[PDB]
Amino acid sequence: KYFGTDGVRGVANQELTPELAFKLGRYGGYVLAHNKGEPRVLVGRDTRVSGEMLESALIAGLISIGAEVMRLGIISTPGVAYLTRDMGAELGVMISASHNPVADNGIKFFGSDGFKLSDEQENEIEALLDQENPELPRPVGNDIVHYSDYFEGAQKYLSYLKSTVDVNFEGLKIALDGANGSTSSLAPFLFGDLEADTETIGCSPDGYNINEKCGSTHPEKLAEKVVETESDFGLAFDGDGDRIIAVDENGQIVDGDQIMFIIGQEMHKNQELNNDMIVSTVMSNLGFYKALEQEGIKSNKTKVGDRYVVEEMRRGNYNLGGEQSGHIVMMDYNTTGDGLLTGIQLASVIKMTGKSLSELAGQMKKYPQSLINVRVTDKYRVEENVDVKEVMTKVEVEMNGEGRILVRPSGTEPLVRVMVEAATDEDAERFAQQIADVVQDKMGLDK
Amino acid sequence: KYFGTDGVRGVANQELTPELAFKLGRYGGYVLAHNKGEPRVLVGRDTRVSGEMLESALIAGLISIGAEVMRLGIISTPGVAYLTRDMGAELGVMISASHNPVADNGIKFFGSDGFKLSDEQENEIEALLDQENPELPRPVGNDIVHYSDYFEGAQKYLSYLKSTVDVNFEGLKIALDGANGSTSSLAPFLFGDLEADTETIGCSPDGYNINEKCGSTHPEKLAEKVVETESDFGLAFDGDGDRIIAVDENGQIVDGDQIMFIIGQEMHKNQELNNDMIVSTVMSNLGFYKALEQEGIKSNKTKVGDRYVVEEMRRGNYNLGGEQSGHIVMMDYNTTGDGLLTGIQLASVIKMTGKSLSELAGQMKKYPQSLINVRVTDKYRVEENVDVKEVMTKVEVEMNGEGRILVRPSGTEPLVRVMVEAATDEDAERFAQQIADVVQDKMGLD
């Protein structure tokens, strides 16, 4: 299967080749081009050098079927999602591998509604990939259209982001890390235009340095800068700009759960939070759930992955959801995780309250976590297994209520993931080992 | 066999697909550009839509191989050839189909020396196209290079063209037809910068109007303009600007043969002509050859085609050669047929003498041409046939000096081309039909 969890990803020029990018543009176009005359498609990318070669290969595929291609250049993945629906386009494509290093690259698609592709269409694309020679339209002469360069899209996206906040950031000092990625050209202008004084790092891309000791994945240098410049707070983005991780005034790190809590707290007070609930994955820390209970906010847990958070939010029409990693979705403004949008909305809360990030983030304490992997036969049996159930109960019994345990299998791998959250590092490691031991003896294929 | 007479030509997205353009960039790049670590290749195109689509596919092939691509945008084919030599670039690529209509497009390659590919280089590329899975370099990470835009090149090409002339064009009013091609943005500036007054048509390309009722192939619209604007003369260009056709004061057409004669005449007296000779194809009219006898110029005849003209020019190092179609090569300045260069050099001769085109064109008379194609059973028996030999032999005797018949079979298709050039139309058809009648009786179809 070419399509993975989040589009088609591989190492650029061997696993993900220009020939594949051409096929994805031609086939992906036709699947999305059987429903409109003279299809309009927009394509964006991040700062990887391999994006230039893949884009030209992809654009050739889109043109070869008759589409009107609109090159956005360097833009964040949410920018593609927003522009696609706002311009009424049939499809949007983002070329990026997010946090992965420069060698890797990927191709992501967006529908006319700003959402990821439907699986029936994803499979139809793959069915065309299976055919050695599929007959397809071959427009000639006047039937081919001129593509256009839509340099306006980046600022049109930025102006929309500016519209969401209702106050400027004067009096705030903010440090930004663009991860040498698509945000490098967007975050300095966006916050600078809102009157915030800015200190920047990771905003000098060269085509090979994306996500190199910078970004949401590596926030240390940012925390170093925030303390050095005595800034009020700092924000770190990833290569394609769908995730954000924050740093407070003292250099402590604020994860997605805390950011989700701060923003959901303010939405709750203003009664803009839909159904007084926040969607999230179970991987979020226990302290996050208890803080939501204190604030009277119902919590909904879903399986790990962007697919399921957004899936759940659409089903019930919830306006806020996200993951601990920093991938946070605000339905009222965008249809996918947007680090830039989440960043300004966080800064808005800091401006209105007159507080600091450490105080707003300090509202919830994160319990220590211990994680263990056990290579088992058949992953469904684990929680049906009697011995596994009983030790979990004992562990559950021993913690009066101060902690929780999670036993989940990973779809990518053939092993189970033992997650324990407890009051103390030593407790968390101990309950995890007790549970992992029981699984290892009775479920360890790879004993 | 993908390669034709002038590179790979076909209808864009049907005969030649972006998939093919990708392979030509990937395979052609490896074969022709790899004697340096990060080869530098230059890419240009004309105004046709699909030039955008084929370019992106080609550039992907070049990058996937490790090349440093430098886009030139819209430029004439000689511009690519000239720039490739001046920049020390490993290879140059031009995306165009020349005079052909908008639907067609093509890919032509240039070596570091500014010359088209050798048949050996042509053969090697086709072998890679045939291989099911050839293992070629696949650079990853830092190994891939950034492509770049060299739009500055177009003005450097124009400044170089200005350098070739030693005098201005003040006092001249010139009409230009750009064929909605690459010359559309270059010829008005080039002649205007030389102080000539300009009236232009066919300089409004929209991607679908190239070579549409204008250009070297269609000079009727320009000749109309020359008379109406009361201009001294007019110049017509093709889609990719490797050909030139001129129009006199009265609207008559001046072909490549006459343009070659005018330019070679001035070179000869000034002794700029190397070995006092001009290279040309057999397709050239006899009046061109007779005028060369009146002057002190020798002449070499070669097989039809751009390649063979320049090939002969390199072997003996002659500086002037061309075709009747308007594809003319000036070795001292460029390595391929350049319509813009020839346009300046033609006008340059006019200003120095102070004469007009009609007087310069009248130096040679064009004998009327009659062309007939006959379906045959085969051609390799047609030259041997006695009845054909007998009518042709009778023809050689009847015209002691009246002209010449040329009989040339096509390997491509099973017909014989019967061409006769004679003093009067009435003579030629007496020879053209008589010969074609004899050929028709013997082969083709019972």
Author numbering:
A (entry chain A): 3 to 40, 43 to 451
B (entry chain B): 3 to 40, 43 to 450
Text taken from the publication that reported this structure:
In the human pathogen Staphylococcus aureus, c-di-AMP is produced by the di-adenylate cyclase enzyme DacA, which is thought to form a complex and be regulated by YbbR and GlmM, two other conserved proteins. We determined the atomic structures of the S. aureus DacA and GlmM enzymes and show that GlmM readily binds to DacA in vitro and blocks its activity by masking its active site. Specifically, our data suggest that GlmM blocks access to the active site of DacA and in this manner prevents the formation of catalytically active head-to-head DacA oligomers.
In order to gain structural information on the S. aureus DacACD/GlmM complex, we first set out to determine the structure of the S. aureus GlmM protein in isolation. The S. aureus GlmM protein and the B. anthracis protein, which share 67% identity on a protein level, displayed a similar fold and dimeric arrangement and the structures overlapped with an RMSD of 0.996 Å. One GlmM monomer consisted of four α-β domains with the fourth most C-terminal domain linked by a flexible loop. The reconstructed model for the GlmM sample showed an elongated particle, consistent with the dimeric arrangement found in the crystal structure and with previously published findings. A sequential fitting of the GlmM dimer structure followed by the fitting of the DacA dimer structure into the SAXS envelope of the complex with Chimera yielded the best fit for a model with a correlation score of 0.9196 in which a DacA dimer is positioned on top of a GlmM dimer. In this model, the active sites of DacA protomers are occluded through binding to the GlmM protein, while the GlmM active sites are still accessible. In our model, the DacACD active sites in both protomers are capped by the α5 helix of GlmM and neighbouring residues. Interestingly, positioned next to the α5 helix in GlmM is residue F155, which in a previous study was shown to modulate the GlmM-CdaA interaction in L. lactis. Upon binding, GlmM completely abolished the activity of the DacA cyclase enzyme, while GlmM activity was not significantly affected upon complex formation.
